[PDB]
Design a binder for this molecule. Structure first.
Ligand SMILES: [Cl-]
Ligand SMILES: [Cl-]
Ligand SMILES: [Cl-]
Ligand SMILES: [Cl-]
Ligand SMILES: [Cl-]
Ligand SMILES: [Cl-]
Lengths: 215, 226
């Protein structure tokens, strides 16, 4: 059984946060919701679609109908910033299971929006001479701290060989993240260019490098 | 108050097994089952299975068929999860969680959780990094600012620390968290943003420290010959 959540939501304090969880006829299921802050275990915030466990503030509510379950945080507060996960049980045609959604990173806005700076380094001559190649995409000075990174060879997306870090705060309190594409020297020199594309809050910035050009 | 207390994690070689424990207190152990959930770094929650502490029923995720086994010890209120034939894909934080019952017609939520323990799977012995320069753009001929850095490749275990010019350069520095490659080796980068008019006059050296291997590297980062 598949559960689909949006990767991220941005919400100002005092406004309403809406986190959805899609599934085929999910309204025929019971949905449970969890809150998880960095370095911590999850906390159950809504159970059985709409019920608040004891100790959960009344600004958390839930509903479920058709193909969408919804966690709502009314009058959201700074401390509600967290990742939120939905969950269901399924009878599994005789082999019962639980499944989680992919999670939604809910940022409660606490500083000004900042658009990312992207710096893409080609493989160094030193590394190429060691018979290896790494493209290094560094993403800095952004807020909210949520991005998607996509790599391309020429125009074709590349998934294999990629590793990306979760954003964390810089000295100046904005976020930075990093992504790497590991290639052989042959792969590097056999395409016209490679690109790192960063999506932040609905828009994208792309940097490109080329094996034949001194970046 | 309900508490679930975990231990048993370690660094493991591929092919090995790990056994994680989950010691419960503050409620009637045999009246609530225990689920296990794991989370790869930066990724989402994934259900592994569940055990009935009263009757021994065990239900496992299909993707783990054959290589997970869950047990309990009633006398100590402890649940265990053994995961066999480990690979680097199994690097994750492993949680236990209390879940009343799970069956063919019920699946209660996970109302209390253990703290989580990190199992790292890697074939690597201690290994110092290879450091490569991330040279400033050949286009930074004039004024403004320029980014430059050091790529710190293929070390084990964590951590690495990086300074610039022996700590004399701190403004504009950011050293990133590491990635863990499928090889079981870590890499990271450190970057600094400097005046582009300094690129011909000021030397820039990254000072990389990997104490586990007693390695220090001072890597000069210069503009490129092209
Ligand atoms: Cl989103
Ligand atoms: Cl917690
Ligand atoms: Cl709690
Ligand atoms: Cl309220
Ligand atoms: Cl024990
Ligand atoms: Cl799952």
């Amino acid at each position: 059984y598949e559960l689909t959540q949006p990767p991220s939501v941005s919400v100002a304090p005092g406004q309403r946060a809406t986190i959805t969880c899609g599934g085929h006829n999910i309204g025929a299921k019971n949905v449970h919701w969890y809150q998880q802050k960095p370095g911590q275990a999850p906390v159950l915030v809504i159970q059985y679609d709409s019920d608040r466990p004891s100790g959960i503030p009344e600004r958390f509510s839930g509903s479920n109908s058709g193909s969408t379950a919804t966690l709502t945080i009314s009058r959201v507060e700074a401390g509600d910033e967290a990742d939120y996960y939905c969950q269901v049980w399924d009878s599994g045609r005789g082999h019962p299971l639980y499944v989680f959604g992919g999670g939604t990173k809910v940022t409660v806005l606490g500083q000004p929006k900042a658009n990312p700076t992207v710096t893409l380094f080609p493989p160094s001559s030193e590394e190429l001479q060691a018979n290896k190649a790494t493209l290094v995409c560094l993403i800095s000075d952004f807020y909210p701290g949520a991005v998607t990174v996509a790599w391309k060879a020429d125009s074709s997306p590349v998934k294999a060989g990629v590793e990306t870090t979760t954003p964390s705060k810089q000295s100046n309190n904005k976020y930075a993240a990093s992504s790497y594409l590991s290639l052989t020297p042959e792969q590097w020199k056999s395409h016209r260019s490679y690109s790192c594309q960063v999506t932040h809050e609905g828009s994208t910035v792309e940097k490109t490098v080329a094996p034949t050009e001194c970046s | 108050q309900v508490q679930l207390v975990q231990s048993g994690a370690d660094v493991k070689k591929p092919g090995a097994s790990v056994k994680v424990s989950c010691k419960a207190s503050g409620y009637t152990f045999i009246h609530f089952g225990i689920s296990w959930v794991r989370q790869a770094p930066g990724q989402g929650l994934e259900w592994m299975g569940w055990i009935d502490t009263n009757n021994g029923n065990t239900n496992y995720a299909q993707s783990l068929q054959g290589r997970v086994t869950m047990t309990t010890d009633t006398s100590t209120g402890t649940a265990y999860m053994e995961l066999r034939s480990l690979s680097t894909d199994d690097t994750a934080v492993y949680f236990c969680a209390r879940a009343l019952e799970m069956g063919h017609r019920s699946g209660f939520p996970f109302d209390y959780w253990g703290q989580g323990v990190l199992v790292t799977v890697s074939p690597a012995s201690t290994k110092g990094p290879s450091v490569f320069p991330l040279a400033p753009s050949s286009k930074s001929t004039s004024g403004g600012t320029a980014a430059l850095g050091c790529l710190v490749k293929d070390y084990f275990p964590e951590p690495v620390t990086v300074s610039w010019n022996s700590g004399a350069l701190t403004s504009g520095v950011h050293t990133f968290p590491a990635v863990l490659q499928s090889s079981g080796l870590y890499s990271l980068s450190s970057v600094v943003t400097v005046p582009s008019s300094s690129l011909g006059t000021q030397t820039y050296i990254c000072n990389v420290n990997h104490k586990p291997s007693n390695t220090k590297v001072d890597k000069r980062v210069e503009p490129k010959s092209c």
